[PDB]
A paper describes a structure:
We present structures of CAK-CDK2-cyclin A2 bound to AMP-PNP and in the nucleotide-free (apo) state and of CAK-CDK2 in the presence of ADP-nitrate or ADP-AlFx at resolutions of 2.4-3.2 Å. To understand the mechanism by which CAK binds and recognises its CDK substrates and to gain insight into why monomeric CDK2 is preferentially phosphorylated by the CAK, we aimed to structurally characterise complexes of the CAK bound to both monomeric and cyclin-bound CDK2. To investigate this hypothesis, we turned to our cryo-EM structures of the CAK bound to monomeric CDK2. These structures have been obtained in the presence of either ADP-nitrate or ADP-AlFx, which have been used previously to mimic phosphorylation transition states in kinases, including CDKs. Although the nitrate or AlFx groups were not observed in our cryo-EM maps, these reconstructions still provided additional insights into the T-loop conformations of CAK-bound CDKs. The increased flexibility of the CDK2 T-loop in the absence of cyclin A2 probably increases the likelihood of Thr160 insertion into the CDK7 active site. This may help explain why the CAK has a higher enzyme turnover, indicating a higher rate of phosphorylation, on monomeric compared to cyclin-bound CDK2 (22).
Numbering used by the authors:
A (entry chain K): 6 to 21, 28 to 36, 48 to 147, 164 to 284
B (entry chain H): 244 to 308
C (entry chain I): 1 to 38, 44 to 129, 135 to 238, 244 to 284
D (entry chain J): 11 to 30, 36 to 165, 171 to 310
Amino acid sequence: KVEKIGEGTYGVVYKAEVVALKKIRAIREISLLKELNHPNIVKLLDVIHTENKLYLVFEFLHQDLKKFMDASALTGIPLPLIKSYLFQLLQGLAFCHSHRVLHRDLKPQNLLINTEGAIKLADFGVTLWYRAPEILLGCKYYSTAVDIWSLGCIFAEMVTRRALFPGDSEIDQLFRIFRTLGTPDEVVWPGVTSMPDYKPSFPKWARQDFSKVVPPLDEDGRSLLSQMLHYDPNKRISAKAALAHP
Amino acid sequence: ALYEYQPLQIETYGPHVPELEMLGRLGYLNHVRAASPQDLAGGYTSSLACHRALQDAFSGLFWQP
Amino acid sequence: MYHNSSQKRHWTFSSEEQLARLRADANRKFRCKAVANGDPVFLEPHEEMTLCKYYEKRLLEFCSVFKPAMPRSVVGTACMYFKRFYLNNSVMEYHPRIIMLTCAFLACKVDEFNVSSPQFVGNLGQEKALEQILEYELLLIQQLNFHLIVHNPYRPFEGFLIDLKTRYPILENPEILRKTADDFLNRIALTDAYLLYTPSQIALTAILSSASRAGITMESYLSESLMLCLSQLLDIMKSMRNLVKKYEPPRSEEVAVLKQKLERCHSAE
Amino acid sequence: RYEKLDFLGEGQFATVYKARQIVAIKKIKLGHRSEAKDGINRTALREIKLLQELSHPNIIGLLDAFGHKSNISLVFDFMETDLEVIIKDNSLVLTPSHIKAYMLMTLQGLEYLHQHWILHRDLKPNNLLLDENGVLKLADFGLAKSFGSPHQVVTRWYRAPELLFGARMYGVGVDMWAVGCILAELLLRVPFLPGDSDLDQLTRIFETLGTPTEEQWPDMCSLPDYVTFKSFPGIPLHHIFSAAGDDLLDLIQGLFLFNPCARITATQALKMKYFSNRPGPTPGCQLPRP
Ligand SMILES: Nc1ncnc2c1ncn2[C@@H]1O[C@H](COP(=O)(O)OP(=O)(O)O)[C@@H](O)[C@H]1O
Ligand SMILES: Nc1ncnc2c1ncn2[C@@H]1O[C@H](COP(=O)(O)OP(=O)(O)O)[C@@H](O)[C@H]1O
Ligand SMILES: [Mg+2]
């Protein structure tokens, strides 16, 4: 092994062309990573099954997006770079949504970046900062708009160099979403009064313009972010539709 | 077999610390900052801070190595 | 609480003779190791003590201007870590310039002063310093015998101030005793009394010294309000005052020549 | 020094191995690449700094904390099982004496912890380990914080309503609510308030115990993450626990008071009538084992 990259909640990551080896003491991740062949996603090369431990082989990217913005907090990421990153992520998400698969865990820590300037999805199988109001309000339906909401949150964090909704708890997260995007009225979001975790005594916060929510973005970028940041899951812009966005 | 209560005995090696309940009548709490409604909602009182300060001030005063 | 903690059980010594014995033993161990590995460049224990106090002053200065807002309990814990580390170890084996930074980092982590490595190193070659602190953190933790809790006398000082404001009506305004006693505390910081006496005793003698300087006697406080033993506590306070009085700061030329000699030893080995 | 004997488990924070007196070595994980410049993990440091100052038979003890490079390994005593397995085991019967003994051990540990001004903050049935001699000990001190000087919270199933409403400053009330929830789980063999989210947890709490007014919780709107609720009548306590006595009902009512200041503490609870009644708590040797 070249070195030990680290270890998450499951498995140990090693570095060893340079590849990454994940050691697991499962089948769902292998099945989810074997059915798509896309250049904007981490590809599982080989699987080694041993009575000691299971080994998964992936391509090696030096760092992730979270460390990238941590190091570039003062330098500032130029607009073409973040635009290209967002478009690559949207292409990957559209390819994923073409198949019957859901990520639901889109955070900048889970996105990996290479030296050439390509960002690929990872971890196809605490995270309150990138949760959709549908999931927060106790809706069991897992649509494809949650990935778009998380991608919009990541995009806003990248452009503003700061998390859009840095809440600490689920209730505080929902409150921050309500302050930043107004109150989810029935006319704005049909069926909002039907989820188990909706209370009529919620504060009636008012909507504010995105000019103060995401200042440095352009009009087209603000419109795309607003379309991705929609209370109604049915009205959220799909990844395929987001790909064909000026 | 019945469990009989018995308070724990730990040597503070210092002057006797007044009881937490009595801190109201003895007048200690008049020499600190009044607790906010916010931390009073969660169960945090200035009596606890005064008791901790008094306990630490009298902790290990009559002790030698 | 202090009366059932490891600091009282292990890091409080009877007299300065034990401290001198431990420092001399550390210097002798380093000299024996160096002579076994295979002489004028060596430093006597008094030179080591002078350099340790100079670097403790340097750590005080560093924590004074540290950003963001740096509490005083964390600074006290860092200084106590420095003293505990260099009581049993020689100054030339590990350079104090990075050891004080490691102690500050460990104190910030332990005392719940949430700060990250970039913020810690921005207060200062920063990458090399970060690597050195990361390498030395485990060594510092092991040298402290995994006793990373330290009770500073500031909380007992505040408790004594509250009790004096409540139960002592002879003295009118306790605030006049806030400054001078605190100053005395700072002097006790430089002296080795942190490893000899309990924090409550330190706060008490600081308060009584401040009152004596102000001209107000407090024998009634000790005798009656504290139920007081009396002669023993008074002797402890007198020894504290003597320890503060006999302390002196090192001169500039001695510090410079000792620093040059230490750099020579560190570059030689 | 410590030969590894078996593998116990692996969590998000650390991995535990049973090693040889048989002990448990918990090795913290290096974490992600964004947590590589932080040296030793703050959870292990917190466990070390808080477990080296406490010595009680009902608190987990740090035998050793040897480490190498940036990896640190904590040595704890070996525990056969925990209280969660006892709750979820259908083969055994939880008599009132067993519940009394478990509550007594938990409350004695909590009293000793609160005397030294430490809040466990992570009280759960799986966090109350049981050794081979049937002695309950609190564990998982990675969230424990010292209180008394002017967002790491337990799971929603045992989170106190003050914590659910976002209380930054709190006393021993949160641990008291957690041990009350543990008592309810012991009695009913089921999660008393198994909410699906924070809002769902609050809804379940207010449906099972009734939404309190300002006369029972004097400070409500002061908390920042506070939401108003309907006036649910609340199921009577004796209806929920049909097999519980009147003294046990009073203890439960005190443990579940919506006012943290008025909520009974460990000292008040330990001297209550329920623990002094008949029969006495079960000795540790006779406690059930799966
Ligand atoms: N193929 C890879 N290339 C580069 N880095 C990787 C790769 N796979 C995993 N990593 C690194 O390993 C760390 C842990 O990843 P992961 O196992 O997905 O975390 P978790 O499973 O706990 O969410 C991440 O910080 C990531 O940077
Ligand atoms: N003293 C101990 N003896 C044996 N096993 C222990 C001990 N303390 C903890 N464990 C193990 O730790 C595991 C629980 O870890 P957990 O609390 O889920 O980690 P995290 O807090 O990171 O989620 C259990 O499976 C248990 O076997
Ligand atoms: Mg646990």
